[PDB]
Curated annotation (Swiss-Prot), chain A:
This is Histone H4. Demethylation is performed by JMJD6. Monomethylated, dimethylated or trimethylated at Lys-6 (H4K20me1, H4K20me2, H4K20me3). Monomethylation is performed by KMT5A/SET8. Trimethylation is performed by KMT5B and KMT5C and induces gene silencing. The modification N6-succinyllysine is found at residues 17, 63, 77. PANTHER family: HISTONE H4. The modification N6-methyllysine is found at residue 6. The modification N6-glutaryllysine is found at residues 17, 45, 63, 65, 77. Pfam families: CENP-T_C. It comes from Xenopus laevis (African clawed frog). The lineage of its organism: Eukaryota, Metazoa, Chordata, Craniata, Vertebrata.
Swiss-Prot record, chain B:
It comes from Saccharomyces cerevisiae (strain ATCC 204508 / S288c) (Baker's yeast). ATP-dependent chromatin-remodeling factor which functions as substrate recognition component of the transcription regulatory histone acetylation (HAT) complexes SAGA and SLIK. It recognizes H3K4me. SAGA is involved in RNA polymerase II-dependent transcriptional regulation of approximately 10% of yeast genes. At the promoters, SAGA is required for recruitment of the basal transcription machinery. This is Chromo domain-containing protein 1. Residues 37-192 form the Helicase C-terminal domain. Present with 1620 molecules/cell in log phase SD medium. Belongs to the SNF2/RAD54 helicase family. Component of the 1.8 MDa SAGA complex, which consists of at least of TRA1, CHD1, SPT7, TAF5, ADA3, SGF73, SPT20/ADA5, SPT8, TAF12, TAF6, HFI1/ADA1, UBP8, GCN5, ADA2, SPT3, SGF29, TAF10, TAF9, SGF11 and SUS1. TAF5, TAF6, TAF9, TAF19, TAF12 and ADA1 seem to be present in 2 copies. SAGA is built of 5 distinct domains with specialized functions. Domain I (containing TRA1) probably represents the activator interaction surface. Disruption phenotype: Decreased sensitivity to the cytotoxic effects of 6-azauracil. It is found in: Nucleus. The 2 chromodomains are involved in the binding to the histone H3 methyllysine at position 4 (H3K4me3). The CHD1 helical C-terminal domain (CHCT) binds DNA and nucleosomes. The gene is CHD1. Signal peptide: none annotated.
Length: 88, 263
DNA sequence: GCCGCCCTGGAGAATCCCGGTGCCGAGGCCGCTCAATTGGTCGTAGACAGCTCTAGCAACCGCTTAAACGCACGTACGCGCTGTCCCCCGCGTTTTAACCGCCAAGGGGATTACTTCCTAGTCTCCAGGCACGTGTCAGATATATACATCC
């Protein structure tokens, strides 16, 4: 059975264990338990869908199919997370 | 079957969803209009003493053909971008061995470079056409090398009234351009050049779209007017014609003996 | 007499330094060019004054009473120590996919310019909805009076 589906579902597993370890090293974490990574993936997925839904709403207001960087900036700004370096 | 969740609808609408080792091959053959011609060509070339390369632009369609030959039961070998170079060398040496049981060798069209030797094969089936005609020319020259002992026959598979029509039209225009600039500047005819350039430009401004599978064939300007003709093929083959009594008895006995040996 | 071995001098080549000349980053200069400036006019936003009525404030009173406070006791819990085991970390090895560089055509979207028309601003007039006050009315509540009854 060489044929399969083109779509992929484990794209949350693309945020690998050493990436979460590096993000914890930037946060000053010395020791990490093994159950941290699934919780971190769930938290990142929740945050990403919260930002992406607002960005998509900003995109469909402009009658567009392309999510620009300014829509992401506005979506982050509305929830209280202002991001610099992309608004100019 | 390149689309997701499309084999299930064909299996549940025609073979009533049981998928019992025989209607899967029927769905593979009768889902696409290229596959009935491919099956007839494969049976005819297996009947004769021919070996065939099959070139595709997609590796997922190569997976579809590999599954078709797996359920069909034909010794095939494969090459695309996923196969590393050691297994590529192994497969090319296995296909070119004099004691080879392989019959069909599948390629993705743009892989392998110009250094693939495919001496032993005779027929080339271009399943999907390329935008660049030089890619298809290199695909045909994989088997049409210096010292070839057999008449190389190329079959190009085209879906009627589809988007592949303008693919072939753009490929024909690019071949016309290459024959204009490159082929007429190689290495009393200057007067007839002003007529034959006009003739080839009238060919370039005209649309090509207005004993059929024979592996045989019985001044240079008329040579280029060949291999641009369109040979329309009509199958009119229903659901129960394929997998004949020889193939159905072999498929049912193999399925019945598999339950006895479990595994 | 003839042949082989040890000691010392001057000429040929490699390297450092300096001068002439060409290339990358940045600043002065020029040209377009559109938005800030200047000048004038006018309407109105807001400052100012005035009167009326209500809330706040400083400092005191008096009374009540429930909350705050102090103290004694007791015991529950924070914390320290020890064991243990398990799970995470460090490291070596193998795989694998990210990354970068490539087609191949086509659509999405950002601009520039132009046309058109629908819709919202503006103005005038008017009327009814909202805010306030009041007469009236039916449901809820308390007691007046008469009848059956126990001791």
């Amino acid at each position: 059975a060489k044929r399969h589906r083109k779509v992929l579902r484990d794209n949350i597993q693309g945020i690998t264990k050493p990436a979460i370890r590096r993000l914890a090293r930037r946060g000053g974490v010395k020791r990490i338990s093994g159950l941290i990574y699934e919780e971190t993936r769930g938290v990142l997925k929740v945050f990403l869908e919260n930002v992406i839904r607002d960005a998509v709403t900003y995109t469909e207001h402009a009658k567009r199919k392309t999510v620009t960087a300014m829509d992401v900036v506005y979506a982050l700004k509305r929830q209280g997370r202002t991001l610099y370096g992309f608004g100019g | 079957y390149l689309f997701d969740n499309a084999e299930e609808r064909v299996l549940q609408k025609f073979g009533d969803g049981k998928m019992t080792r025989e209607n899967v091959l029927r769905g593979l053959i009768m889902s696409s209009g290229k596959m009935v011609l491919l099956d007839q060509l494969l049976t005819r070339l297996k009947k004769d003493g021919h070996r065939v390369l099959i070139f595709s632009q997609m590796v997922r369609m190569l997976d579809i053909l590999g599954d078709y030959l797996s359920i069909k039961g034909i010794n095939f070998q494969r090459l695309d971008g996923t196969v590393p170079s050691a297994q590529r060398r192994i497969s090319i040496d296995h296909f070119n061995s004099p004691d080879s049981n392989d019959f069909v060798f599948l390629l993705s069209t743009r892989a392998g470079g110009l250094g693939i030797n495919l001496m032993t094969a005779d027929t080339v089936v271009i399943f999907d056409s390329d935008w660049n005609p030089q890619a298809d020319l290199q695909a045909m020259a994989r088997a049409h090398r210096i010292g070839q002992k057999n008449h190389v026959m190329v079959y190009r598979l085209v879906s009627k009234d589809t988007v592949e029509e303008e693919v072939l039209e753009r490929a024909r225009k690019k071949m016309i351009l290459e024959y204009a600039i490159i082929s007429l500047g190689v290495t009393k005819k200057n007067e007839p050049n002003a007529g034959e350039l006009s003739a080839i430009l009238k060919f370039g401004a005209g649309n090509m779209f207005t004993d059929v599978l024979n592996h045989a064939e019985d001044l240079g300007g008329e040579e280029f007017l060949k291999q641009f003709e369109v040979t329309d093929y009509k199958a009119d083959i229903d659901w129960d014609d394929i997998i004949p009594e020889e193939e159905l008895k072999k498929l049912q006995d193999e399925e019945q003996k598999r339950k006895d040996e479990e595994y």
